[model samples]
Target: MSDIELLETLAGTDQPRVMATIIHVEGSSYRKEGAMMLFQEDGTQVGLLSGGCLETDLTIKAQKVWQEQLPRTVVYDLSSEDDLSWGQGSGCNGTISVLLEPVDLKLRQHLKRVYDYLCAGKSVFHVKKLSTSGAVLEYAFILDESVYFGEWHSGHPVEWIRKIDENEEPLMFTHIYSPKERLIIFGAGPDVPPLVTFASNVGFYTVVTDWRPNQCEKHFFPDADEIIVDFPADFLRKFLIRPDDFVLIMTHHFQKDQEILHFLLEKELRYIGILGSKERTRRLLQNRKPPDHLYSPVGLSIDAQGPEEIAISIVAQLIQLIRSRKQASSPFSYLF
Candidate 1:
């Protein structure tokens, strides 16, 4: 089942559950910045926090948290000999901080809302457990379209926000959105298959679109959250594309690419990348005369060739964009 489905189940249960996310990584580690793990009140684990090294121990600790209904921080030392077996099977020398926050009924509802918003293409930073001493936890608001990180307040609870924001470096600090990453890829072709597969594995809500009816079949995008067949430009309008949504156009047709670009240029999309060579991209831009801010040519200058290689390059660039967005001064923060 999907993570969302698993989360939904945990949300509905009377048992308590907590989600452990690796928001930051300092050195070589098994998981990246956005790694997550879900722990049920009955001591069930749904995700991985470390390649597999920390799950057993973390599960034990998670059950304790579930019973106590308290939030705590877990720090793991990867290089210590005493913690030899804790690094899973690999020699990953990195320290990870996982905030174990319990999800009661209310928090679960809030998380469900956050997940839904993210799935619908919103860039969010849904902050739960903003403070440890109070019954209420605060969340901050910021959107990809907005240029500011908003005002800072004084006090310990406020300090938590500062510290967490520093460690997490979330892309968009919007009370208006949740910190869930959702992207949609338009086109399920030879170059698109690996992207769809890899995106699913990495936990992005990817939607593959194509004008060719046959190309939109499930076999083509078994990993995608959804497959769409129709003119992409029109389909996108009905797809609930949000400002925080990431859109990728690799249709292999200049007309389709141009049409999509023209439509997207006016919207508040977070990232719009087109997969093509520099020459082709330039010609399309010239013909379309899209606003100078419209598209990123060659999509990241990874200097890639062939289908799989290009797919890897695009995904790499997407990761970079996602990471960079976490910073206060993100690379895409200037666009209108």
Candidate 2:
């Protein structure tokens, strides 16, 4: 489940829970600094911080934080060759600092705001104080405005906001939450179900669209977040496709694919994949050429023979595109 979904599920419970957030990392680590995991009083967890070694240890530490009802930072040093703190030679060989804070009612509200913005297809920024000063565990979310959470007795909100506005890392750690990648599949055929299921499972918000009412039914696509029955040309006109959206044209109808491609090639989409042979796509774009961003003969070359294999190849290609695009525009890239 997504972090938002998990937070919503745990929102109403009166049971004590702790949110473990990675605030800093000094060396190689499996997950980055912004990674978070939610731990319940009953030992249930919502997210992961590392592959598998860190959760159990973190959970034990989180129980103590829950008892104290205060936030505390813990550091784990995995760099020592002879140290068995993380098991014999199984350490990540890095220093990880995690902040364990109680999830009180006020903090839950702030988290909900973050969730709401992401759900509404907007990006939001978060600021988490790392130092163990008077109000060390304070945090806030910033969009057009700031919503403060926790205490900030020693820190100045105005200065922090100024640093954030200048795109400068403050004394605290900062994280940005962007909307999930959207995958719009322009076909709802038998082959499309696997693609939608795989993509959705891997964190893409999948939408299946088709002109046929039967093909667009929910039963055909149990995993798709949206099922739309509309003509390709009309849907393109009505829907607002964001620049970060991934569009896959697999209607399997020659005329319909051409009509969709004509409209999509003009948009500023992040990735556009058309499922067909190079010759077929060449004919589809007869007089006009596709934009350089278009991926004709979609999917990685895996010698896929069946629908499932083809779906795997296509999802792999989509993952590659998403990662490369993120790396290109990453804030860390600018920092380095």
Candidate 3:
């Protein structure tokens, strides 16, 4: 189930408390910037911010906070011998900030809207102060639809990104961004059905493009969000693709695929995959004078042997790439 769906289940069951965790690390870390965990008042939990080390204590603390109607910040440090005794499994050696908040009907509704907005590609900034008056006040932060984090001063002064390591155990300033990648599927042929279906299941806003008038039929892509009946390059011009967007060129016809490739190579897109054999891919590369950065044969090297399997393999590769920490190929560094 999706994270949102699971969260809905927790809310529907009248769970009194929910804990949201965001990571603040020094160098490399296990989870990415926007990872989270949700806990119910009954101590049932879904999602994760750190690895396995800190959940039990967090859940126990969450139940207390829920009963008292008090919010608290819980921090874990793997480096300190004293702190390490509070939990198990080495504690991830990083500073984790868990906000133990009361999840009443009103609050749960607000959180649902917040999550829905982020999932729809909107950026959100949430600010909550944990102290009424003090020299050491606790502040919690949540940023939706942004990627970069750590040690950056916000121009706003009062709102800033805190630099904390796993060992340091800092308790403020946590940010999270949603993962919303758009899928641009070029070409509508017999092979398009399975690929588009898989894309929809994986939460991509799939757009199908085909130049032929009859090829852009609704029946071909019943699950797709849009069907574009226009030249590939023209369609691309109308839709300025973002760096977070993905492109798939599955048009079997060489000339049509090359036309789209030449235009796309100039734009900034997240992932690009082409559907074809190595021989066809090589020939297309040879004939085209496009930029070297075009991502072709876009799926993982799964040795896929058929249309349905190829679609599944391609979607799998996209998921892997989306979750990876590796940088995407720059325009100048792409190899055929």
Best by TM-score: 2
Q: Give the better candidate number (1 or 2) by TM-score.
A: 2
Assess every candidate by TM-score: 0.65, 0.87, 0.63
Candidate 1 regions off by >4 Å?
1-6, 12-36, 40-44, 51-54, 69-77, 81-182, 236-241, 265-269, 287-303, 329-336
The whole-model lDDT of each prediction reads: 0.64, 0.76, 0.62
Q: What RMSD, rounded to one decimal, does every model reach?
A: 6.7, 3.5, 7.6
Model 2, 1-336: lDDT tens digits are 565565565556657889887887898888787788888876678787665456767788888887877788877775553444445643676888888888887777777777777788766666666554423556666554334444455455545656563545435776777777899999988899989988988889888899999878798788899898999988988887887789999999999999988887777878889998989999999878577688878999988977799899989999898766655573223233
Best candidate according to lDDT:
2
lDDT for position 224 in model 2: 90
**Model 3 over residues 1-336: C-alpha lDDT tens digits?**
344444456546665766565434443346654456677755567766554546767777777766776666665564442543554455344555456665655557656665665567664344343342211233322442233222233433122333333432343443333444578888888888899899888877788889887877898789898898988878877977787688888888899877777676667666767777656767776765544435556677778878898898889988887667354432212211
Report the C-alpha lDDT of model 1 over 1-336, residue by residue, as the tens digit: 344555456546656677676644678787765566787757667767675457766777777776787766666765552453633444568877676667766566656665665466455443444343322234433343332232223343334555664534433122223334567787777789888877677667787888899878788778887787888867966877877678888888889887887777667767888876667767776765455334455355667778877777777877777777655543234431
Model 2 vs. true fold: TM: 0.87
| Model 2 segments more than 4 A misplaced | 12-14, 79-89, 133-137, 145-170, 326-336
